[PDB]
Amino acid sequence: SMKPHLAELRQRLAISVLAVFVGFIIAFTFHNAILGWITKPLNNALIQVGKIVEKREMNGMITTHQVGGAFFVALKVSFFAGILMAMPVILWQLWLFIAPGLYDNEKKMVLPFVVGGSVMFLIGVLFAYYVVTPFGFQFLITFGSFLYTPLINIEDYVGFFTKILIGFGIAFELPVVAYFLALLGLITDKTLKDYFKYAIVIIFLLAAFLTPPDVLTQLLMAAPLILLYGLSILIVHYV
Amino acid sequence: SMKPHLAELRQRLAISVLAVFVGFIIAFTFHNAILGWITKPLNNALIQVGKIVEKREMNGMITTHQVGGAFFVALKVSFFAGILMAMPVILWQLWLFIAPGLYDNEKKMVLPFVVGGSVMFLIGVLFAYYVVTPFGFQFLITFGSFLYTPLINIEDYVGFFTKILIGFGIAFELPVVAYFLALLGLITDKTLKDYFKYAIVIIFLLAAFLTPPDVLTQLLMAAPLILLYGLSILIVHYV
Amino acid sequence: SMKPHLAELRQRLAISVLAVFVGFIIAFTFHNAILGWITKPLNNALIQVGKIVEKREMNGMITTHQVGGAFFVALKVSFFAGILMAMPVILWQLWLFIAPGLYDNEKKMVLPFVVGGSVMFLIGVLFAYYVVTPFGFQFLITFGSFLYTPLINIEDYVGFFTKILIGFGIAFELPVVAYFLALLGLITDKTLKDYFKYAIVIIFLLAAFLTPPDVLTQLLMAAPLILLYGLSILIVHYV
Amino acid sequence: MFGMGFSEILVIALVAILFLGPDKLPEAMVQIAKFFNSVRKTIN
Amino acid sequence: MFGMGFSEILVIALVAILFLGPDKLPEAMVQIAKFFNSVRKTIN
Amino acid sequence: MFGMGFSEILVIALVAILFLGPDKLPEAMVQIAKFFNSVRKTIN
């Protein structure tokens, strides 16, 4: 019973692990370029706020507080980029695992959905970076510019930046899954309005899981999820 | 059975949540003032130790190591001040919940006790700030003044400062709790001397709960609690 | 049954705790010397990389991001040195606890093994410091030298450095225990090769336990353990 | 518990009390208990 | 377990062995077991 | 769980699947279950 489902899973997990490793190798080869891409908005915001502060008066830059800091930041960036490059291979292998269980209609139900969701994730990441990150970074540096000196360390910044990008990708995806489920027909506006009582509890659970043990971070993460749920209700209503 | 005790609890928790939200709004309106109040001892200590260091030789200041750093420090301060301002509303709603359960004598026992405990908490926080924080901060800055440079970031400092104030308030409360239980009569010096075996274990459990997983922080938090227990024993003995 | 095994265990734990306290007192008396010893490689690497950076162009130093930072770093160093100083007393008390359970041959088997393991641990710590720490620290500072500014804070550095020394000591020890078990005769190369499947799972569990919840740290800690296992297999094979 | 503090658990409980309420909170509790019992009996 | 490491648990056990000791540690263990059993039978 | 995140548990499970595999993984699971049952019956 479980013997073939463990042998095949073992082989597919092995191929996925090999893909992640090769992606990590390529990403560590180009880690200077990836780190430059990641840190470009931070440098731009620091220069802009330096100009603002110099105008007001008439410094801050990127730091490392550990050796493992810079080296591990390169390794972390390479690992994430490798996981991303392996994602087509991992997803195709998961599809190969799941496919003999789905019927013929479910196959065409799923595949275009996967392509559209991936496209929306990419659009969300690009939007996050190019639109959100400049203005948000400028605002957040300028918020503590007249009090504190911005000695921004790369170790926390890489995680912060990756969280922003991944979260915006997921935020672009969730409306699309709502619109898909509305088009095919599995949920209506009534379903999303009547399941909000449980949705909000699950949202706060997810916020606790995805944030440090502080309550304030939990609320700061739950608010976008509640807004996404409301936007989803609107989308399914107009469908 | 649980239907009214869930409906009433729901309404009172709603009132408390609304009060906390309004307090957060007011506190974020005055967050610059509250942050200046919180950071004033840090600036004073840095200037004083700078004078000491310049005297010895013949720099350090407040920093931000993240963007979310400054913005989230403002949000954290506003959240704490909001909780503090809502505390009368929350305590009054808790009293409204518990009151039909206590007899008429327990009410007269409790209310002045609540007032006295709140007063002692306030006195402890004020003492912490005005007496302890200057001297302690100067000592701690000067301890590492001849080796390292004090690039103190606001993100950890706000938590440290809040822990200091809350702990000193609680430390001022607990002897008052012992004195109240001694005057009214529920414990004697024998009770506190005979239950120290379990008191110390509970103290170490609390120190583990209220500190990072390091053992040294656990001992550093247990020692003041043991001293508070001894002072409590003295207070009850002299009553 | 358990009454003597609790009374004796209590007395031996009391002796060990008193030894740790005395060791901490001595270590805090000499905490300036111990901190200078711990920070010497960091200063050396910073000066060397400063020379390299100035050569390329034609700054970084040790900081404190909290005040509890410097004082707690002194306390932390003193605590570890106290544990190290008391370690002979703790080990001797543990030997007294365990000895009446071992037979006469096990005694001779164990005590030289304890001496050899302690010596190997010391050699590993000395190797870590004097050989590894200079080159490793220089490499790691120079890795992010052309991008970031190394504002290395003592709080994280003390922990990182302690992990390096402890891990190198344990790494020097594990081959010696493999060689001892191969000499006395309890394992062979077949035993170590046939139990690698479970050994790698236990290694990943240990890496998860000994590292932050990040997966990358887990892999970075598992790799040396796998290499040590392979070296152990080689040692047992040649024995 | 996996980056989920005690205060976060209390906040989740607060949200559950506020939004589920006098009704559907006992229903949700009994549904969770039934799911746990089904899981236990399946893994038995 | 809520910012409570394994070493902190070991220190709590150390304090329990030191201060409770040969006596009152089995008593405390049996009292804790009785409290846990009472809680289990009440929530049943 | 004592500085061990969910992703680390997933990685440990991945390593167990990869290195134990179709065989010796059910054997290891039944051995772990037997050890847990023995511990439970001894502490009873």
CSV table of N, CA and C in Angstrom, one decimal, chain C residues 66-154:
chain,number,residue,atom,x,y,z
C,66,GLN,N,23.3,47.6,23.2
C,66,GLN,CA,22.5,47.7,24.4
C,66,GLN,C,23.5,47.8,25.6
C,67,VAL,N,23.0,48.4,26.7
C,67,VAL,CA,23.8,48.6,27.9
C,67,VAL,C,23.9,47.3,28.7
C,68,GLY,N,22.7,46.7,29.0
C,68,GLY,CA,22.6,45.4,29.4
C,68,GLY,C,23.5,44.5,28.5
C,69,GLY,N,23.7,45.0,27.3
C,69,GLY,CA,24.6,44.3,26.4
C,69,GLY,C,26.0,44.1,27.0
C,70,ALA,N,26.7,45.2,27.3
C,70,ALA,CA,28.1,45.1,27.8
C,70,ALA,C,28.1,44.4,29.2
C,71,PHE,N,27.2,44.8,30.1
C,71,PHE,CA,27.2,44.2,31.4
C,71,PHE,C,26.9,42.7,31.4
C,72,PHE,N,25.9,42.4,30.6
C,72,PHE,CA,25.5,41.0,30.4
C,72,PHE,C,26.5,40.2,29.7
C,73,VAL,N,27.3,40.8,28.8
C,73,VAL,CA,28.4,40.1,28.1
C,73,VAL,C,29.4,39.7,29.1
C,74,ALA,N,29.8,40.7,30.0
C,74,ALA,CA,30.7,40.4,31.1
C,74,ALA,C,30.2,39.3,32.0
C,75,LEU,N,28.9,39.3,32.3
C,75,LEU,CA,28.3,38.3,33.2
C,75,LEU,C,28.3,36.9,32.5
C,76,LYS,N,28.0,36.9,31.2
C,76,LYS,CA,27.9,35.7,30.4
C,76,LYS,C,29.3,35.0,30.3
C,77,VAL,N,30.3,35.8,30.0
C,77,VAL,CA,31.7,35.3,29.9
C,77,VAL,C,32.1,34.8,31.3
C,78,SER,N,31.8,35.5,32.3
C,78,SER,CA,32.1,35.0,33.7
C,78,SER,C,31.4,33.7,34.0
C,79,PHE,N,30.1,33.6,33.6
C,79,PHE,CA,29.3,32.4,33.8
C,79,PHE,C,29.9,31.2,33.1
C,80,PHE,N,30.3,31.4,31.8
C,80,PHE,CA,30.9,30.2,31.1
C,80,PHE,C,32.2,29.9,31.7
C,81,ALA,N,33.1,30.9,32.0
C,81,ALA,CA,34.3,30.6,32.6
C,81,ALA,C,34.2,29.9,34.0
C,82,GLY,N,33.1,30.2,34.7
C,82,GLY,CA,32.8,29.6,36.0
C,82,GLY,C,32.4,28.1,35.8
C,83,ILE,N,31.6,27.8,34.8
C,83,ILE,CA,31.2,26.5,34.5
C,83,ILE,C,32.5,25.7,34.1
C,84,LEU,N,33.4,26.3,33.3
C,84,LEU,CA,34.6,25.6,32.9
C,84,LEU,C,35.5,25.3,34.1
C,85,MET,N,35.7,26.3,35.0
C,85,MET,CA,36.5,26.1,36.2
C,85,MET,C,35.9,25.0,37.1
C,86,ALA,N,34.5,25.0,37.3
C,86,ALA,CA,33.9,24.0,38.1
C,86,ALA,C,33.8,22.7,37.5
C,87,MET,N,34.0,22.6,36.2
C,87,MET,CA,33.9,21.3,35.5
C,87,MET,C,34.7,20.2,36.0
C,88,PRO,N,35.9,20.3,36.5
C,88,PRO,CA,36.6,19.2,37.2
C,88,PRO,C,35.8,18.8,38.5
C,89,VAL,N,35.2,19.8,39.2
C,89,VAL,CA,34.5,19.4,40.4
C,89,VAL,C,33.2,18.7,40.1
C,90,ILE,N,32.5,19.3,39.1
C,90,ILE,CA,31.3,18.6,38.7
C,90,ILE,C,31.5,17.2,38.1
C,91,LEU,N,32.6,17.0,37.4
C,91,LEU,CA,32.9,15.7,36.8
C,91,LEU,C,33.3,14.7,37.9
C,92,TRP,N,34.0,15.2,38.9
C,92,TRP,CA,34.5,14.4,40.0
C,92,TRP,C,33.3,14.0,40.9
C,93,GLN,N,32.3,14.9,41.1
C,93,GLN,CA,31.1,14.5,41.8
C,93,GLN,C,30.2,13.6,41.0
C,94,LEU,N,30.1,13.7,39.7
C,94,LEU,CA,29.4,12.8,38.9
C,94,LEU,C,30.1,11.4,38.9
C,95,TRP,N,31.4,11.4,38.9
C,95,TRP,CA,32.2,10.1,39.0
C,95,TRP,C,31.9,9.4,40.3
C,96,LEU,N,31.8,10.2,41.4
C,96,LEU,CA,31.5,9.6,42.7
C,96,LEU,C,30.1,9.1,42.7
C,97,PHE,N,29.2,9.8,42.0
C,97,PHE,CA,27.8,9.3,41.9
C,97,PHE,C,27.7,8.0,41.1
C,98,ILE,N,28.5,7.9,40.0
C,98,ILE,CA,28.3,6.8,39.1
C,98,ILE,C,29.1,5.6,39.5
C,99,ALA,N,30.3,5.8,40.1
C,99,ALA,CA,31.3,4.8,40.4
C,99,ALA,C,30.8,3.5,41.1
C,100,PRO,N,29.9,3.6,42.2
C,100,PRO,CA,29.5,2.4,42.8
C,100,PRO,C,28.5,1.5,42.0
C,101,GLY,N,28.3,2.0,40.7
C,101,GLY,CA,27.4,1.2,39.8
C,101,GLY,C,28.3,0.5,38.8
C,102,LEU,N,29.5,1.0,38.5
C,102,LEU,CA,30.4,0.4,37.6
C,102,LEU,C,31.2,-0.7,38.2
C,103,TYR,N,31.6,-1.7,37.5
C,103,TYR,CA,32.5,-2.7,38.0
C,103,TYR,C,34.0,-2.2,37.8
C,104,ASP,N,34.9,-3.0,38.4
C,104,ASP,CA,36.3,-2.6,38.4
C,104,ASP,C,36.9,-2.3,37.1
C,105,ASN,N,36.6,-3.1,36.1
C,105,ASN,CA,37.2,-3.0,34.8
C,105,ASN,C,36.7,-1.7,34.1
C,106,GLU,N,35.4,-1.4,34.3
C,106,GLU,CA,34.8,-0.2,33.7
C,106,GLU,C,35.5,1.0,34.2
C,107,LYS,N,35.9,1.0,35.5
C,107,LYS,CA,36.6,2.1,36.1
C,107,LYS,C,37.9,2.5,35.3
C,108,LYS,N,38.7,1.5,35.0
C,108,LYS,CA,39.9,1.7,34.3
C,108,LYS,C,39.6,2.0,32.8
C,109,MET,N,38.6,1.5,32.3
C,109,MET,CA,38.2,1.9,30.9
C,109,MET,C,37.8,3.3,30.9
C,110,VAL,N,37.1,3.8,31.9
C,110,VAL,CA,36.5,5.2,31.8
C,110,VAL,C,37.5,6.3,32.1
C,111,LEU,N,38.2,6.2,33.3
C,111,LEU,CA,39.0,7.3,33.7
C,111,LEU,C,40.1,7.8,32.7
C,112,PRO,N,40.9,6.9,32.2
C,112,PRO,CA,41.8,7.4,31.1
C,112,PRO,C,41.1,8.0,29.9
C,113,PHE,N,39.9,7.4,29.6
C,113,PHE,CA,39.1,8.0,28.5
C,113,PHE,C,38.7,9.4,28.9
C,114,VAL,N,38.3,9.6,30.1
C,114,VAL,CA,37.9,11.0,30.5
C,114,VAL,C,39.1,11.9,30.4
C,115,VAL,N,40.3,11.5,30.8
C,115,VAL,CA,41.4,12.4,30.7
C,115,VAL,C,41.7,12.7,29.2
C,116,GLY,N,41.7,11.6,28.4
C,116,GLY,CA,42.0,11.8,27.0
C,116,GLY,C,41.0,12.7,26.2
C,117,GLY,N,39.7,12.5,26.6
C,117,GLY,CA,38.7,13.3,26.0
C,117,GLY,C,38.8,14.8,26.4
C,118,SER,N,39.1,15.0,27.7
C,118,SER,CA,39.3,16.4,28.1
C,118,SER,C,40.5,17.0,27.4
C,119,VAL,N,41.6,16.3,27.3
C,119,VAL,CA,42.8,16.8,26.6
C,119,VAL,C,42.4,17.1,25.1
C,120,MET,N,41.7,16.2,24.5
C,120,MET,CA,41.3,16.5,23.1
C,120,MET,C,40.4,17.7,23.0
C,121,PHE,N,39.5,17.9,23.9
C,121,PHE,CA,38.6,19.0,24.0
C,121,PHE,C,39.5,20.3,24.1
C,122,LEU,N,40.4,20.3,25.0
C,122,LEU,CA,41.3,21.4,25.1
C,122,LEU,C,42.1,21.7,23.9
C,123,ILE,N,42.6,20.7,23.2
C,123,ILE,CA,43.4,20.8,22.0
C,123,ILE,C,42.5,21.4,20.9
C,124,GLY,N,41.2,21.0,20.9
C,124,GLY,CA,40.3,21.5,19.9
C,124,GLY,C,39.9,23.0,20.1
C,125,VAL,N,39.8,23.4,21.4
C,125,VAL,CA,39.5,24.8,21.7
C,125,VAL,C,40.7,25.6,21.3
C,126,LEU,N,41.9,25.2,21.7
C,126,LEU,CA,43.1,25.9,21.3
C,126,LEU,C,43.3,26.0,19.8
C,127,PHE,N,43.0,24.9,19.1
C,127,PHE,CA,43.1,24.9,17.7
C,127,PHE,C,42.1,25.9,17.1
C,128,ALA,N,40.9,25.8,17.5
C,128,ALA,CA,39.8,26.7,17.1
C,128,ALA,C,40.4,28.1,17.2
C,129,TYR,N,40.7,28.5,18.4
C,129,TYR,CA,41.2,29.9,18.6
C,129,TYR,C,42.3,30.2,17.7
C,130,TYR,N,43.5,29.6,18.0
C,130,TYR,CA,44.8,30.1,17.5
C,130,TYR,C,44.9,29.9,16.0
C,131,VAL,N,44.4,28.8,15.4
C,131,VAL,CA,44.5,28.6,14.0
C,131,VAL,C,43.2,29.1,13.3
C,132,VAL,N,42.1,28.6,13.6
C,132,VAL,CA,40.9,28.8,12.8
C,132,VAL,C,40.4,30.3,13.0
C,133,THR,N,40.4,30.8,14.2
C,133,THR,CA,39.7,32.0,14.4
C,133,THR,C,40.3,33.2,13.6
C,134,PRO,N,41.6,33.3,13.6
C,134,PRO,CA,42.2,34.4,12.7
C,134,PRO,C,41.8,34.4,11.3
C,135,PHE,N,42.1,33.3,10.6
C,135,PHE,CA,41.8,33.1,9.2
C,135,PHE,C,40.3,33.2,8.9
C,136,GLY,N,39.5,32.5,9.7
C,136,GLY,CA,38.0,32.6,9.5
C,136,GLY,C,37.5,33.9,9.7
C,137,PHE,N,37.9,34.6,10.8
C,137,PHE,CA,37.4,36.0,11.0
C,137,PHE,C,37.8,37.0,9.9
C,138,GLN,N,39.1,36.8,9.5
C,138,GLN,CA,39.5,37.7,8.4
C,138,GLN,C,38.7,37.4,7.1
C,139,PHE,N,38.5,36.2,6.8
C,139,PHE,CA,37.7,35.8,5.6
C,139,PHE,C,36.3,36.4,5.7
C,140,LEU,N,35.7,36.2,6.9
C,140,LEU,CA,34.3,36.6,7.0
C,140,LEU,C,34.1,38.2,7.0
C,141,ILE,N,35.1,38.9,7.6
C,141,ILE,CA,35.0,40.4,7.5
C,141,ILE,C,35.3,40.8,6.1
C,142,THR,N,36.3,40.2,5.4
C,142,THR,CA,36.6,40.6,4.1
C,142,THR,C,35.5,40.2,3.1
C,143,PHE,N,34.6,39.3,3.4
C,143,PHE,CA,33.5,38.9,2.5
C,143,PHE,C,32.5,40.0,2.3
C,144,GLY,N,32.2,40.7,3.3
C,144,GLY,CA,31.3,41.8,3.2
C,144,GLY,C,31.9,43.2,3.3
C,145,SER,N,33.3,43.2,3.0
C,145,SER,CA,34.0,44.4,3.2
C,145,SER,C,33.8,45.5,2.2
C,146,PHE,N,33.5,45.1,0.9
C,146,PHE,CA,33.3,46.0,-0.2
C,146,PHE,C,31.8,46.4,-0.3
C,147,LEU,N,30.9,45.9,0.6
C,147,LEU,CA,29.5,46.2,0.5
C,147,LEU,C,29.1,46.9,1.8
C,148,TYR,N,29.3,46.4,3.0
C,148,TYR,CA,28.8,46.9,4.2
C,148,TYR,C,29.9,47.3,5.1
C,149,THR,N,29.5,48.0,6.2
C,149,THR,CA,30.5,48.4,7.2
C,149,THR,C,30.3,47.6,8.5
C,150,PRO,N,31.4,46.9,8.9
C,150,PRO,CA,31.3,45.9,10.0
C,150,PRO,C,31.2,46.6,11.4
C,151,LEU,N,30.0,46.9,11.8
C,151,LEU,CA,29.7,47.4,13.2
C,151,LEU,C,29.4,46.2,14.1
C,152,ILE,N,30.4,45.4,14.3
C,152,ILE,CA,30.2,44.2,15.1
C,152,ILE,C,30.0,44.4,16.5
C,153,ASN,N,28.8,43.9,17.0
C,153,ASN,CA,28.5,44.1,18.4
C,153,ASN,C,28.8,42.9,19.3
C,154,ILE,N,29.3,43.2,20.5
C,154,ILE,CA,29.8,42.2,21.4
C,154,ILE,C,28.8,41.2,21.8
